[PDB]
C-alpha cells in the first residue's frame, strides 16, 4: 500500500565559515582501489553519525511500493546485493525510508 524510499549514502569523514573539508570513497571504475578523495562541503548539508563521520542531507534514492515494511526490507536488501551496496541498514517509521551508508 505505502511507498518506501531507500537512500544510498556515501559516508563522509570530516573535521566557522560554513565550509567543511571532507573525504569519502568514490567508485568508477566499478572495482578500483576504492578511491579516497577530498571534497568541500556546506556544514548545514551534512547530518552527523554515531562517531567524526557524516552523511549528506539528500542521497541517490530508490522507491518501492510494498505490501508491508517487511517485504520492502527484502526488496531493498536484494536491490543492494544486485548493485554493490553494503553498509549500515537503518530505517525510519516516519520517513518509511531505508538509509544505507557506504564507504
Amino acid at each position: 500500500m505505502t511507498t518506501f524510499k531507500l537512500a544510498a549514502c556515501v559516508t563522509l569523514n570530516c573535521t566557522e565559515t560554513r565550509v567543511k573539508h571532507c573525504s569519502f570513497n568514490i567508485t568508477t571504475d566499478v572495482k578500483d582501489r576504492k578511491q579516497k578523495v577530498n571534497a568541500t562541503f556546506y556544514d548545514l548539508d551534512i547530518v552527523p553519525l554515531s562517531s567524526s563521520l557524516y552523511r549528506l542531507i539528500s542521497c541517490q534514492t530508490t522507491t518501492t511500493e510494498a505490501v508491508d515494511a517487511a517485504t520492502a526490507a527484502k526488496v531493498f536488501k536484494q536491490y543492494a546485493n544486485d548493485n554493490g551496496i553494503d553498509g549500515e541498514w537503518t530505517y525510519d517509521d516516519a520517513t518509511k525510508t531505508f538509509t544505507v551508508t557506504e564507504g
Partner: antibody
Amino acid sequence: QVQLQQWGPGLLKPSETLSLTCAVYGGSFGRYYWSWIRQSSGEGLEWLGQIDHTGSTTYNPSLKGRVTISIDSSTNQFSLKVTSVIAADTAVYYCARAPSGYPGVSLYQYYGLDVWGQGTTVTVSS
Amino acid sequence: DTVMTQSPATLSVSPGERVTLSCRASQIINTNLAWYQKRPGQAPRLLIYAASARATGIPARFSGSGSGTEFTLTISGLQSEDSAVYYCQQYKHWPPYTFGRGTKL
C-alpha cells in the same frame, strides 16, 4: 553564539513611519539573510523582507513599496522601516537570521530562519 | 505565490502517542520546506529544514518527511514541554517565502 536583539516604538499613529532595529551579537553578517517577519495579534506569520551584507534586498510585494530594510556594517545591526502605517500593521515584529548557502558548494540557497530576536510588539492607533 | 495549507488546526491529543502533522503546498516546492515550533513566551524556533533535516540542536524525536507538495513533521516520544504551535514555511518560490497558518498543539 548569535544573539539577536531588537527594539523600537511599539506605538505610533496612522500615516507615520515604523522603525525597528535588530542588533546581532556574537557573529557577523557573512552571507546570511537578515530578515524581518511579523504576526498580527491572532494571525498568520508574514514575511516582510531581508537584506544581506551587500545591501541586496528583497521585500514582499504584497506590501506594495511600503517596506524598506537597511544594514549598518559598522555596528552589526540592520533595521526595518515601514511607511504609511495603518491599523493592520499591528503585529509582533521579529528580526531573524537565515543562512544563504555557498555558491557552488551548497545544496540549497536558504536554510531555515534559525535565529530569532525576542520580538517587538507594535500597536498602531490614534 | 505558493499557499501553505496545514490541516489539523488543533490536536490536544494524549502524550506518548504518534502524531502526524500535515502541510500542503499549493505548488510544487521540491524540498524547500522548513518547520517551526512556537512556544508561549517565545519566538519561533527552527525544527526541520530542507524538508527533512533536523536543525542543529533540536532532538532526534522530531521527524520531518515529504517532498513536492505534501509534507509532514512527525513527533512521537513526547516530552512535557512539547505543547506549542507548529508552523511550516515554503522557500522554493520567493519573494514571499510563505508560511502555513499553523497547527495548535
